[PDB]
Structures are given as structure tokens and as C-alpha cells.
Coordinates of C-alpha atoms and ligand atoms in Angstrom, one line a residue:
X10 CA 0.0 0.0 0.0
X11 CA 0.9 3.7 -0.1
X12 CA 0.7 5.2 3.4
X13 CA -2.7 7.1 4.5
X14 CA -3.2 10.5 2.8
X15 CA -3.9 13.8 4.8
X16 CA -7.4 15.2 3.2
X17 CA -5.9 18.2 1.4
X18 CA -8.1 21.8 2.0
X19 CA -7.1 22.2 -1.7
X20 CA -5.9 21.2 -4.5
X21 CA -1.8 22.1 -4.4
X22 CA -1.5 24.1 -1.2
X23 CA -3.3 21.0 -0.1
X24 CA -2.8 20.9 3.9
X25 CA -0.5 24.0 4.5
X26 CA -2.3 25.9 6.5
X27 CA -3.1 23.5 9.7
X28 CA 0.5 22.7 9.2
X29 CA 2.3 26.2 9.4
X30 CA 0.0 26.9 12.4
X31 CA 1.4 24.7 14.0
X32 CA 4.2 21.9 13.1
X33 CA 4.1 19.9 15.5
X34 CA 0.5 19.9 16.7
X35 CA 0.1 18.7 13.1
X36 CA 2.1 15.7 13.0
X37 CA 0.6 14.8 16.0
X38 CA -3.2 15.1 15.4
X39 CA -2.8 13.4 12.2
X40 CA -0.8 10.4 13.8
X41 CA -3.4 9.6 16.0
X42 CA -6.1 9.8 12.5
X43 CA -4.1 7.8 10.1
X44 CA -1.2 6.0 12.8
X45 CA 2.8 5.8 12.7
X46 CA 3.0 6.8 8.4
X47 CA 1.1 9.3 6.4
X48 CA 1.1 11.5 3.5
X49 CA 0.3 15.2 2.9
X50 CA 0.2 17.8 0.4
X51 CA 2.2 20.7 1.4
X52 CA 2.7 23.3 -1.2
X53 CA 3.3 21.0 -4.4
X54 CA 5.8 18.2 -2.4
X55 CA 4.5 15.0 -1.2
X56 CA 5.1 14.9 2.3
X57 CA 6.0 11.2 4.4
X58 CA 5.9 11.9 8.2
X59 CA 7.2 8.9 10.3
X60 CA 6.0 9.4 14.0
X61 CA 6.8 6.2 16.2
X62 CA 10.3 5.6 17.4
X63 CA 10.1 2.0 16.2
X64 CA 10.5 2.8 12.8
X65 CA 13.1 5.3 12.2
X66 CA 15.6 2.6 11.5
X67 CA 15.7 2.6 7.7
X68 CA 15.5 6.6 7.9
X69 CA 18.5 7.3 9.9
X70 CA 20.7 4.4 8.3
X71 CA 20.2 4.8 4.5
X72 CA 23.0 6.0 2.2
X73 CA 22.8 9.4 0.7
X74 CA 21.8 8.2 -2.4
X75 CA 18.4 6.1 -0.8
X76 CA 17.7 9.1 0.8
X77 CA 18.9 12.5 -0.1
X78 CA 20.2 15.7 2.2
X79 CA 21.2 17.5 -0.3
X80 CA 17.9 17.6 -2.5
X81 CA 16.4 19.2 0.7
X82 CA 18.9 21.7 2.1
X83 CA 20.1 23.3 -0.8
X84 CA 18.0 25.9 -0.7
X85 CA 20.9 26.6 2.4
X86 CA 22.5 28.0 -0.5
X87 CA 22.5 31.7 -0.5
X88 CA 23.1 31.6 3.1
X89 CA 26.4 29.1 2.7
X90 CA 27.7 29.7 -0.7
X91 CA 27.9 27.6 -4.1
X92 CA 29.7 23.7 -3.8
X93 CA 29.4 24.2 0.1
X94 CA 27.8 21.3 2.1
X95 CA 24.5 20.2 1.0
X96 CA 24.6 22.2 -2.4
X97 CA 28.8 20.4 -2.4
X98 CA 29.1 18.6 -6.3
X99 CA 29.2 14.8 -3.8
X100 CA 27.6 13.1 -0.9
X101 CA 31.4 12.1 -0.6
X102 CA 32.7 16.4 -0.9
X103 CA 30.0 17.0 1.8
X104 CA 30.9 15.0 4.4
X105 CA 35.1 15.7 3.7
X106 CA 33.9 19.7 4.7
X107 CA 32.0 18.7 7.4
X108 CA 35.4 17.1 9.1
X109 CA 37.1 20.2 8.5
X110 CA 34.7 22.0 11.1
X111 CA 34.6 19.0 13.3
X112 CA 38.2 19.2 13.3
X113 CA 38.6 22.4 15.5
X114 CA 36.2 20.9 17.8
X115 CA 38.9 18.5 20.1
X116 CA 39.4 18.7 23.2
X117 CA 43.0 20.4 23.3
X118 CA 40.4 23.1 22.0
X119 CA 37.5 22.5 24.2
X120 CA 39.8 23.4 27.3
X121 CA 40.5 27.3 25.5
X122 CA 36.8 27.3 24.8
X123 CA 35.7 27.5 28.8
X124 CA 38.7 30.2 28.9
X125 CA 36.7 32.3 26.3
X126 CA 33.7 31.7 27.9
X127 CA 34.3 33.2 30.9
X128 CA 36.5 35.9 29.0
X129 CA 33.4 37.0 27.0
X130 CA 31.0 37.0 30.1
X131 CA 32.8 38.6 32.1
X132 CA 33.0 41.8 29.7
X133 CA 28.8 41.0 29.2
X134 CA 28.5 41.5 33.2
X135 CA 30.0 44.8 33.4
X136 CA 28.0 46.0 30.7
X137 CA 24.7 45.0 32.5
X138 CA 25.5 46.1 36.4
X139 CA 24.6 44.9 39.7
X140 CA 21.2 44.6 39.1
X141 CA 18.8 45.0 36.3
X142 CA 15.8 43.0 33.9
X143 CA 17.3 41.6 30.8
X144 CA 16.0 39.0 27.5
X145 CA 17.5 35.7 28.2
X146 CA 16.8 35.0 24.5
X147 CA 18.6 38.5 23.1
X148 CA 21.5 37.6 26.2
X149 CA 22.0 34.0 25.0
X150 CA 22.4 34.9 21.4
X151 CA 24.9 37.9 21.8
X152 CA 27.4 35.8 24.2
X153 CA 27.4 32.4 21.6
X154 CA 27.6 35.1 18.4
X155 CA 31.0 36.1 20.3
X156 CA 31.7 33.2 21.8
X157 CA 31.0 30.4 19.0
X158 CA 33.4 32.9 16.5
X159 CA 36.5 32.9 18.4
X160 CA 36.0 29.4 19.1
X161 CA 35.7 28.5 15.5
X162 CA 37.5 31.4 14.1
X163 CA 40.3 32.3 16.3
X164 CA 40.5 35.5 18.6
X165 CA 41.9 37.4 15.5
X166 CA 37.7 37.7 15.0
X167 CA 37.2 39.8 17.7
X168 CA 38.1 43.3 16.4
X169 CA 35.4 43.0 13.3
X170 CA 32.7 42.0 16.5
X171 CA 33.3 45.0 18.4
X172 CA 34.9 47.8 15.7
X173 CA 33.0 46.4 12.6
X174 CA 29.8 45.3 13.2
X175 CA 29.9 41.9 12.3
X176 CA 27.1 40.9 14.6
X177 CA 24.4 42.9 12.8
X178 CA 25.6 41.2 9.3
X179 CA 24.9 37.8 11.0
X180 CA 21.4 38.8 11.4
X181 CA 21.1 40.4 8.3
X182 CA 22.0 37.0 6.4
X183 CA 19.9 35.0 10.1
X184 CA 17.0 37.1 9.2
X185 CA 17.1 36.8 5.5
X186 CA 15.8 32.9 5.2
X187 CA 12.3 31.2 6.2
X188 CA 10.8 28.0 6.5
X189 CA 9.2 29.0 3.5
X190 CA 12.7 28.8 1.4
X191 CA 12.2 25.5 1.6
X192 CA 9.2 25.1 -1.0
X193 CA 10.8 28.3 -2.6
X194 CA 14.0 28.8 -2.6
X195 CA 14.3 31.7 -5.6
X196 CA 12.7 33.8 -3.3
X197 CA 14.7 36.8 -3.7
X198 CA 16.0 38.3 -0.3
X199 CA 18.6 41.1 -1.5
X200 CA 19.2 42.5 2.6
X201 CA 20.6 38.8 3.0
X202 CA 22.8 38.5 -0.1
X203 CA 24.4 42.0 0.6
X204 CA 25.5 40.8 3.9
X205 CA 26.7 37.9 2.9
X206 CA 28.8 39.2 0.2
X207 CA 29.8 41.7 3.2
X208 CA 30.7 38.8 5.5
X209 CA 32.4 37.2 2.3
X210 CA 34.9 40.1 2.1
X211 CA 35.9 40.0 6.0
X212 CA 36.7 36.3 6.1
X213 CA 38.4 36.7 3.0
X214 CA 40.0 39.4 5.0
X215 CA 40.4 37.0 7.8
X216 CA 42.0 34.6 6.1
X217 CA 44.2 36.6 4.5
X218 CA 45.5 37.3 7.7
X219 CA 46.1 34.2 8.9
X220 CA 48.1 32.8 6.1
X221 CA 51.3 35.5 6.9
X222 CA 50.7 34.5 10.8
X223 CA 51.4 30.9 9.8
X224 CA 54.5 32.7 7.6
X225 CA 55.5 34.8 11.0
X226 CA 54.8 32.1 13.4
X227 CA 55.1 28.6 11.9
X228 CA 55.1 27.2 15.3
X229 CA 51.5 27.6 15.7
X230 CA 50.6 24.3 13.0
X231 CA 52.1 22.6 15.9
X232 CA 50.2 23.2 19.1
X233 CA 47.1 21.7 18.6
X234 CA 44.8 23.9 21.1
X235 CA 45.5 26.9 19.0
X236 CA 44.7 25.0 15.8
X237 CA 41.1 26.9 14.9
X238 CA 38.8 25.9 11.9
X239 CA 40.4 28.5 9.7
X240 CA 43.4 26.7 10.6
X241 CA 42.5 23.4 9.4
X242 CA 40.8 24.7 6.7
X243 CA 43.8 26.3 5.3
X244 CA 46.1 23.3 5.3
X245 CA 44.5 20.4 4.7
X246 CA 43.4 19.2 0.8
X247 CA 40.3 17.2 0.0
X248 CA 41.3 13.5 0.4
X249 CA 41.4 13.2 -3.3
X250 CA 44.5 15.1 -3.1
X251 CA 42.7 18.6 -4.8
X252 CA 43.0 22.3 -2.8
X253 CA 40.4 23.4 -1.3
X254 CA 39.5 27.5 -2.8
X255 CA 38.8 30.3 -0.1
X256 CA 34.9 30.9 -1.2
X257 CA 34.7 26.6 -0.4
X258 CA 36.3 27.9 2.8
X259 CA 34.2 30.9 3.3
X260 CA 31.4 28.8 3.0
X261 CA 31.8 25.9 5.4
X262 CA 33.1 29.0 8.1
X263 CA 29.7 30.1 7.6
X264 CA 28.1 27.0 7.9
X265 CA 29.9 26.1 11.1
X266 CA 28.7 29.4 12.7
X267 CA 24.9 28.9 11.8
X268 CA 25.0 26.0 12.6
X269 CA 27.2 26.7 16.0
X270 CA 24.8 29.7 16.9
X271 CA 21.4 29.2 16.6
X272 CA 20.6 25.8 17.9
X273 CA 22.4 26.3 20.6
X274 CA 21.0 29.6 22.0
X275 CA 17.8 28.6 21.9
X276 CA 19.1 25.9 24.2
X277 CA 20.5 28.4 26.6
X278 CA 17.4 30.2 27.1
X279 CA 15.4 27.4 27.0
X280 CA 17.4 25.4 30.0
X281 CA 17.9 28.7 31.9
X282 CA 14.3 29.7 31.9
X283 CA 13.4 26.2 33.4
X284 CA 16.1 26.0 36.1
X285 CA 15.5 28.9 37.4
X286 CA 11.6 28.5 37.4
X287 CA 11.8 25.6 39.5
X288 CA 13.1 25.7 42.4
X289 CA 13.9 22.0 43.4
X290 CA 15.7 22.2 40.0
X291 CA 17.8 24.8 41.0
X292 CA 19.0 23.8 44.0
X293 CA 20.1 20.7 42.8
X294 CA 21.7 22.6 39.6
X295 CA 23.7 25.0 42.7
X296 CA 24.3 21.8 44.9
X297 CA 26.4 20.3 41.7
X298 CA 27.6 23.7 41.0
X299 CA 29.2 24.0 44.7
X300 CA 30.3 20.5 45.2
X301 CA 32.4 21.0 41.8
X302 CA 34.0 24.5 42.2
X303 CA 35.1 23.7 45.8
X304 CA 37.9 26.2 46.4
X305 CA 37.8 26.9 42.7
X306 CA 37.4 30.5 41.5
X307 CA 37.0 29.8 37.7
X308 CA 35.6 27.4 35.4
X309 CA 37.5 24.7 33.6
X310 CA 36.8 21.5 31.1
X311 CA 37.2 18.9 33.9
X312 CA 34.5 20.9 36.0
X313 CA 32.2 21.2 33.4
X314 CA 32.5 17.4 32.4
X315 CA 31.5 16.3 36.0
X316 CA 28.2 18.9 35.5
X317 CA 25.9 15.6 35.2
X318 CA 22.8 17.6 36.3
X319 CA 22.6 20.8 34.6
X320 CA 23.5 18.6 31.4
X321 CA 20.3 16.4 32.2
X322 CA 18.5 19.8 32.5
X323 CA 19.8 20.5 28.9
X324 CA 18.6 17.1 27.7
X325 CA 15.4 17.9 29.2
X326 CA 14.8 21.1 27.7
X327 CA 16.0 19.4 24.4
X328 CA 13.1 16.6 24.7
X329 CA 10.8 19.7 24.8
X330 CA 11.9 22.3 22.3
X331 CA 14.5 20.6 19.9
X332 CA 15.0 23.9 18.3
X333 CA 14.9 21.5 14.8
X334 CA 11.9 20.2 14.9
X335 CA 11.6 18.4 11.6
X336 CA 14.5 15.9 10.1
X337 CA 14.3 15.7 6.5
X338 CA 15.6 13.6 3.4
X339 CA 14.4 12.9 0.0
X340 CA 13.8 9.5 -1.1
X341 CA 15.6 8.9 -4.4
X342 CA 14.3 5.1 -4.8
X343 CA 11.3 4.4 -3.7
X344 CA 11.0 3.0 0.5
X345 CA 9.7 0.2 2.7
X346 CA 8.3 1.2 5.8
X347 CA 6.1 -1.0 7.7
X348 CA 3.6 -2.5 5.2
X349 CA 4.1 0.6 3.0
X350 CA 6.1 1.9 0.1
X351 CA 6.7 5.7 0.3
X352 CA 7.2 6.6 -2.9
X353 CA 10.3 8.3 -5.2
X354 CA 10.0 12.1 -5.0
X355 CA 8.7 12.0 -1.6
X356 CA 10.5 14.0 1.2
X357 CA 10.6 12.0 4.4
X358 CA 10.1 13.7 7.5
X359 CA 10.9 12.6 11.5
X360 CA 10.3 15.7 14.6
X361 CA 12.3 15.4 17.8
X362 CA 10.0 17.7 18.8
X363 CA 7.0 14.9 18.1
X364 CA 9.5 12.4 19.6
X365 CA 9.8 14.0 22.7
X366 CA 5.9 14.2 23.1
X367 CA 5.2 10.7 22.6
X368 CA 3.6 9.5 26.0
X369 CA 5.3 5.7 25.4
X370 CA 8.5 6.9 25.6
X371 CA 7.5 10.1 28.2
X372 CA 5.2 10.3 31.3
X373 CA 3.5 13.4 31.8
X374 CA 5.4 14.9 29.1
X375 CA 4.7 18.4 29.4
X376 CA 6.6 18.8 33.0
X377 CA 10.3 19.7 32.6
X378 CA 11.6 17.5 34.9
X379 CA 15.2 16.1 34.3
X380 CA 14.4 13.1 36.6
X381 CA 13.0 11.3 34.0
X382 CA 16.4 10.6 32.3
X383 CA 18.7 10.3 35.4
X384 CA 16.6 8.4 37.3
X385 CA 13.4 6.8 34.9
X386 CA 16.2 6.9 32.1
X387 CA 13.0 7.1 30.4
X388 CA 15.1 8.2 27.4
X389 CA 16.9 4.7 27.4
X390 CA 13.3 2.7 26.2
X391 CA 13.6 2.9 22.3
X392 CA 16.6 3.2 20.4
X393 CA 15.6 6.4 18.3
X394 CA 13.5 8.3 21.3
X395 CA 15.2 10.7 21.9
X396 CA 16.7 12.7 19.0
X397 CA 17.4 16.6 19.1
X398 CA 21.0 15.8 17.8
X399 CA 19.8 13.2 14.7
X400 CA 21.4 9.8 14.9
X401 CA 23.1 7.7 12.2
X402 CA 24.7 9.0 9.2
X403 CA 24.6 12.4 9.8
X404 CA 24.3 12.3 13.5
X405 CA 25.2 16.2 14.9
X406 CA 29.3 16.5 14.8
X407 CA 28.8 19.4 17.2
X408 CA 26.9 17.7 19.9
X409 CA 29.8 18.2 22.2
X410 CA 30.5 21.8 21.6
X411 CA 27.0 22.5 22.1
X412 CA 27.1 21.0 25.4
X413 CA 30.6 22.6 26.3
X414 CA 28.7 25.6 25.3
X415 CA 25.2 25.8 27.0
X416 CA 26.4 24.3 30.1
X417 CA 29.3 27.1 30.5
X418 CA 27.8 29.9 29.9
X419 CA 24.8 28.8 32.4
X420 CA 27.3 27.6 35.0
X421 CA 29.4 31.1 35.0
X422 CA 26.4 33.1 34.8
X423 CA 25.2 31.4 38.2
X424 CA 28.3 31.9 39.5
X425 CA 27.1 36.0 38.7
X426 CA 23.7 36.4 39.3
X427 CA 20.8 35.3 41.0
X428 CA 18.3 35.3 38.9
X429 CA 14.3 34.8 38.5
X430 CA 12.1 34.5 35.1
X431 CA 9.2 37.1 34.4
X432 CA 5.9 35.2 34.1
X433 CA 4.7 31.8 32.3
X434 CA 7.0 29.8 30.2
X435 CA 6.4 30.6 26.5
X436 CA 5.3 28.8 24.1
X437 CA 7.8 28.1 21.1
X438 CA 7.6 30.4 17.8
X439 CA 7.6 28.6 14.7
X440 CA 8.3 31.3 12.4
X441 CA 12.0 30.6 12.0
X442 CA 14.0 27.8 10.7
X443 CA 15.9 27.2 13.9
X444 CA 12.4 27.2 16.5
X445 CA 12.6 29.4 19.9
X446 CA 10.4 31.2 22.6
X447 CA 8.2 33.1 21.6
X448 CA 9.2 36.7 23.0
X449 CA 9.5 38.3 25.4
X450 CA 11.6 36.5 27.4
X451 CA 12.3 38.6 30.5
X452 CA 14.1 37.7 33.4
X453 CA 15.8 40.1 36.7
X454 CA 18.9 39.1 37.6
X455 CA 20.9 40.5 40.6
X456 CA 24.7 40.3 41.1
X457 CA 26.1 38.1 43.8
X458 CA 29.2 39.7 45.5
Ligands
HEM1 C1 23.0 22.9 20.2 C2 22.1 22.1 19.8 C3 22.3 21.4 18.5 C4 21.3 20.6 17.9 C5 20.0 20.3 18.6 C6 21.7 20.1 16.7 C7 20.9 19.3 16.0 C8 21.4 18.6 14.9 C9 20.7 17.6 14.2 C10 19.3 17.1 14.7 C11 21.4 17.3 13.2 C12 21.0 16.2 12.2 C13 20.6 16.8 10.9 C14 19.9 15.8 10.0 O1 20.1 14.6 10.2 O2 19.2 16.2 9.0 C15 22.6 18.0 13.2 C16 23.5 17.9 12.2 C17 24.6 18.7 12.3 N1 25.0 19.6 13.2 FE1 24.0 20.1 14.8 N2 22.9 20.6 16.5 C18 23.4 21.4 17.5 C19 24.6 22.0 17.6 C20 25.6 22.0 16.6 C21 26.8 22.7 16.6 C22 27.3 23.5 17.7 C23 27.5 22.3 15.4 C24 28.7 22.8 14.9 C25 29.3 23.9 15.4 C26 26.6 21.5 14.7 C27 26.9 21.1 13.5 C28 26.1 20.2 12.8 C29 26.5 19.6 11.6 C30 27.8 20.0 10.8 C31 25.7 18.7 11.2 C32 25.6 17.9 10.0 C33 25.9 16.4 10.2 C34 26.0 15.7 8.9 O3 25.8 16.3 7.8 O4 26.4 14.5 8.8 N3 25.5 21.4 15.4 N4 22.5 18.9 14.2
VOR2 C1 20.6 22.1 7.7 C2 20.3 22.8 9.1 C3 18.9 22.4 9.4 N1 18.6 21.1 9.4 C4 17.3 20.8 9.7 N2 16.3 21.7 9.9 C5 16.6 23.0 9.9 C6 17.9 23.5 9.6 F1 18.2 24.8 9.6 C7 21.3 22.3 10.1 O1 21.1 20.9 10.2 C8 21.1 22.9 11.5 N3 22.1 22.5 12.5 C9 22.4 21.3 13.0 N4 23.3 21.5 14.0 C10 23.4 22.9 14.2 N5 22.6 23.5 13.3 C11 22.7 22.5 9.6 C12 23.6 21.5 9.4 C13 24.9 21.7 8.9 C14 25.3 23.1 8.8 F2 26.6 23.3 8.4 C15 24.5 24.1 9.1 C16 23.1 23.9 9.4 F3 22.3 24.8 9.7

């Protein structure tokens, strides 16, 4: 059989519209009409959702040319440049750029990374004072835009941050795509492409740079926690033995960041506003905190490994608002699932966010409540449920940075501030490509010493 089909509204647009209301709500309700796989219309594609854990085998195992990444997110390709990733000329080119990023992410690395963090928080708490109100959501994304690029980038980045402006270009290009690229990606955005032509010329800049700093110190290619991505990017060659060019370069730098920014942020805010809205939570979260600084004045890599808490408290929050709530591939041969074939042409769809709702898996699923996974390791029941980083093929290379990342920068603010959220929880906004709270997200804060 084909799956179930979703009763279009019309013909075309088909079932758009109770869709873009709401995502998530959608998968759901229909599962429940039409069970674990069904079809809809969605502006001219033919739409596969697969909603029960059990079945997400074949999805997350097949080979890039079963089912496709790159016929899906190539419409990335304004934002990340020509050849780059998912619009690269091979499955095989893809996954050799990926490695280049996931290459400045070791742990040599990971140990400067907690330095920065505290560097770049500290200048974030004079500029806010002993007391005040501030967005968590605004706060999040301004330290990870300056964290996340001297991470990836190197400190050299810096300068264009604070003298140049390179934070408002970011949104300019983070502004200038929509969920709505996806069905059309011609759209024409021209805001977006100025910027990133203007972020083109800097890293260009950046680059250009670097390469006389590996002339003047050579030493540097040797120590391997000052070996950034532009690093590794400039001296390595594909494995086929050919160069790489700098707008390939450009490109993946790019990719990294958008990919090192926004999914994490959300995170952040999303974690933080939890902890500090439940007080049982937050004890425990400043128990761990205590037992682990002992004497300690400042954060390190060791410390934030032992945080086994606060990272369930990021899982949690990640069971709740996977910030990408829809996993997608086209199907290039037609597909088995259950009694079914999906057929060619189709783009397959799985939802963390759906996954992290379903009530086999999750018991009273709406409570944050990271005791589910320590303790219920409710998580541990299926193999595939639980899934905000993907799994398989394509699993998230940056997993562990992320987590370096959220649990820092929540750990040393802490440290700072006590701090208390402004009213109900928000629900999440699914206007953007990477989901987040709906604003505002308000929260006082008070220093500490
Ligand atoms: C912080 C929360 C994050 C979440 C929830 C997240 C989620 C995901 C998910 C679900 C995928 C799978 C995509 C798919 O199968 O279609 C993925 C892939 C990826 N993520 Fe993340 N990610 C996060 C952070 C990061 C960071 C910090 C980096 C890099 C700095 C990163 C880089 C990537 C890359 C390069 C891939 C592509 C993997 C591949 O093509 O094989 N992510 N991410
Ligand atoms: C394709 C993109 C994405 N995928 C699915 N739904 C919405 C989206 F925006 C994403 O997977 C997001 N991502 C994953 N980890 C962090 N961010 C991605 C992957 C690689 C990359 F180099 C940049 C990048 F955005």
C-alpha cells in the first residue's frame, strides 16, 4: 500500500495551512487519524511523516543516495555559498567539509573554549550592572555570536565583533531565510545577499590574515589547542588530493557558525528559563555547581564534564523544544516502511520535537523535569527516542561543543547572578527555521558579590 493521505483543504497548497500553524500539533493530530505513516500535500511536495520511534531505522541508516540531504537543504545556499555542504558537487565532498569544522572541535580546543567563555561574560557583566531585567533570548544569542566565533575562528575575529559590526551582518543574512525557502528557494531576499557578500569580504579578510601569521609564526601548525577551523581549513586538501578554494572555505566558516549559533542559543534560554523557574531544580543545579568548584574561582573543562545535572536539565529542555523540529531527506528510490512503500520524490520527514511528546516513551510529558532521564532513564526505552541531535549517518558533529557551550555559559552566569524569570514559560515560535520562545523572554537578575 501507499501510506494514508492527509485530506488536502485544496488542491496544491493541499494541507499548508493547519501545518504552518502549528508543526508539531500537526504531525501529532494526524498520527493519532491515520497511525505511525502518512502523507500530505504541502505546497506541491509529497510529504512522508514517520511518528513512532520504532521505525526510524531505515530513515536514519540509509545511504545518501536512498535518501537525499542535499535535495532538501540546498536551498541553504545563499546563506552558505555555491559547492558548500548540501549544495557540495558529492555526498562524498559534503561529508570531507564537514570534518574540517569537526576538526577544530577536540578537546585540546575544548579546554581554551571555557577560557573564552568566561573571558566574554565577564565583559557581558559589566555592561549590565549589579542589578537590572534583561531577554534571556537577546542575552543568550549575543554571548554564543562572540563566543562560538572565536572558538571557531580564532581571537583574530574579535576586532570585526566590536569595531566592525559583524554581529548585525549575521542577522542580516539569520534574518534573510524562512521556513518558506524550503518550498521556494528563488525567493529573492537582497538584505541577506548584501550581507553575505559583506561577511564574504571579511573572512576573506580573515583569512588573508592568517596565512602571513602561519608565515610569521610557523610554530602555531604545531600546538594543537591553537589550531582553529580557519586553521585546518587552510592546510589540509580534500582526500582526493585537490585544494580546497577560499569561497569553499568561506562557506563551510559560515556553515559552522549557523550552525554553531542558533541551535544552541535557543538551548541556553530554553534550559535557563526552566532551572531557574523551579526551584527544586535549582538547587540541585547549585548543589552540583558547589560540590564541583570547591575552592575553585573559575571554570574549567574537567569541571564542566563532572556537570551531570545541569546537562540532564539541557537534555530535558532538548526533549521539549528541539530547536529543529523536523529531520528531513528525499527518497531517491522508492521506500519500505512497515507494510508501506513511500514513494520516489517523496521528502521524508521525522520531529524530535513529536518524539519528545510521545507518552510511550514520556510520562506526563509536558513537565520539565530532568528526573525522567537520570533516574526513569525514560530516554533509554527505544533506540531512536530521543533525537534533538539526529542519529546515524549524519548524527550532529557538534553535539559536544553545544554542550561545552550551554552548560558554560549557564554555570558562569550562576556563579554571577541570581536570577528569577518574568511570568509563564512561553510557548515556542515557529516562524524561523531554527524554532525558539516566543518573545519576550524577561528575566531580573541581581549580582552576587
Ligand atoms: C546545540 C544544539 C544542536 C542541535 C539540537 C543540533 C541538532 C542537529 C541535528 C538534529 C542534526 C541532524 C541533521 C539531519 O540529520 O538532518 C545535526 C547535524 C549537524 N549539526 Fe548540529 N545541532 C546542534 C549544535 C551544533 C553545533 C554546535 C554544530 C557545529 C558547530 C553543529 C553542526 C552540525 C553539523 C555539521 C551537522 C551535519 C551532520 C552531517 O551532515 O552528517 N550542530 N545537528
Ligand atoms: C541544515 C540545518 C537544518 N537542518 C534541519 N532543519 C533546519 C535546519 F536549519 C542544520 O542541520 C542545522 N544544525 C544542525 N546543528 C546545528 N545546526 C545544519 C547542518 C549543517 C550546517 F553546516 C548548518 C546547518 F544549519
Amino acid at each position: 500500500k501507499l501510506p494514508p493521505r492527509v485530506p488536502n483543504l485544496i488542491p496544491y497548497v493541499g494541507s499548508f495551512v493547519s501545518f504552518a500553524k502549528n508543526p508539531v500539533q500537526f504531525i501529532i493530530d494526524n498520527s493519532k487519524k491515520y497511525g505511525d505513516v502518512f502523507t500530505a500535500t504541502i505546497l506541491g511536495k509529497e510529504m512522508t511523516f514517520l511518528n513512532h520511534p520504532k521505525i526510524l531505522d531505515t530513515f536514519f541508516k540509509a545511504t545518501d543516495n536512498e535518501l537525499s540531504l542535499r535535495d532538501v537543504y540546498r536551498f541553504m545556499r545563499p546563506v552558505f555559498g555555491t559547492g558548500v555542504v548540501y549544495d557540495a558537487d558529492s555526498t562524498e565532498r559534503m561529508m570531507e567539509q564537514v570534518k574540517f569544522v569537526s576538526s577544530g572541535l577536540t578537546t585540546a580546543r575544548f579546554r581554551v573554549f571555557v577560557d573564552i567563555f568566561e573571558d566574554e561574560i565577564a565583559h557581558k557583566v559589566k555592561e549590565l550592572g549589579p542589578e537590572g531585567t534583561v531577554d534571556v533570548a537577546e542575552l543568550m544569542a549575543d554571548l554564543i555570536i562572540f563566543t562560538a566565533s572565536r572558538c571557531l575562528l580564532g581571537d583574530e575575529v574579535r576586532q570585526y565583533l566590536s569595531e566592525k559590526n559583524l554581529g548585525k551582518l549575521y542577522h542580516d543574512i539569520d534574518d534573510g531565510i524562512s521556513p518558506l525557502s524550503f518550498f521556494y528557494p528563488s525567493l529573492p531576499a537582497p538584505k541577506r545577499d548584501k550581507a553575505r557578500k559583506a561577511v564574504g569580504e571579511i573572512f576573506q579578510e580573515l583569512l588573508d590574515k592568517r596565512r602571513e601569521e602561519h608565515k610569521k609564526h610557523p610554530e602555531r601548525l604545531l600546538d594543537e589547542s591553537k589550531m582553529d577551523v580557519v586553521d585546518h581549513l587552510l592546510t589540509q586538501k580534500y582526500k582526493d588530493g585537490q585544494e580546497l578554494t577560499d569561497v569553499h572555505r568561506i562557506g563551510i566558516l559560515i556553515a559552522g557558525l549557523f550552525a554553531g549559533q542558533h541551535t544552541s542559543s535557543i538551548t541556553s534560554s530554553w534550559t535557563l528559563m526552566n532551572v531557574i523557574s523551579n526551584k527544586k531544580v535549582l538547587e540541585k543545579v547549585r548543589k552540583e555547581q558547589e560540590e564541583i568548584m570547591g575552592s575553585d574561582k573559575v571554570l574549567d573543562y574537567d569541571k564542566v564534564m563532572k556537570m551531570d545535572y545541569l546537562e540532564a536539565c539541557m537534555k530535558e529542555a532538548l526533549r521539549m523544544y528541539p530547536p529543529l523540529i523536523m529531520i528531513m531527506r528525499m527518497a531517491r528510490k522508492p521506500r519500505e516502511c512497515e507494510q508501506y512503500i513511500i514513494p520516489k520524490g517523496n521528502i521524508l520527514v521525522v520531529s524530535p520535537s513529536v518524539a519528545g511528546r510521545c507518552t510511550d516513551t514520556y510520562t506526563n510529558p509536558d513537565v520539565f523535569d530532568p528526573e525522567r532521564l537520570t533516574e526513569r532513564k525514560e530516554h533509554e526505552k527505544f533506540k531512536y527516542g530521543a533525537v534533538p541531535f539526529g542519529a546515524g549517518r549524519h548524527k550532529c558533529i557538534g553535539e559536544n561543543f553545544a554542550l561545552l557551550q550551554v552548560k558554560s555559559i549557564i554555570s558562569i552566569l550562576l556563579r554571577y547572578f541570581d536570577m528569577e524569570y518574568i511570568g509563564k514559560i512561553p510557548d515556542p515560535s515557529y516562524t524561523s527555521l531554527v524554532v525558539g520562545p516566543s518573545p519576550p523572554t524577561r528575566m531580573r537578575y541581581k549580582l552576587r558579590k
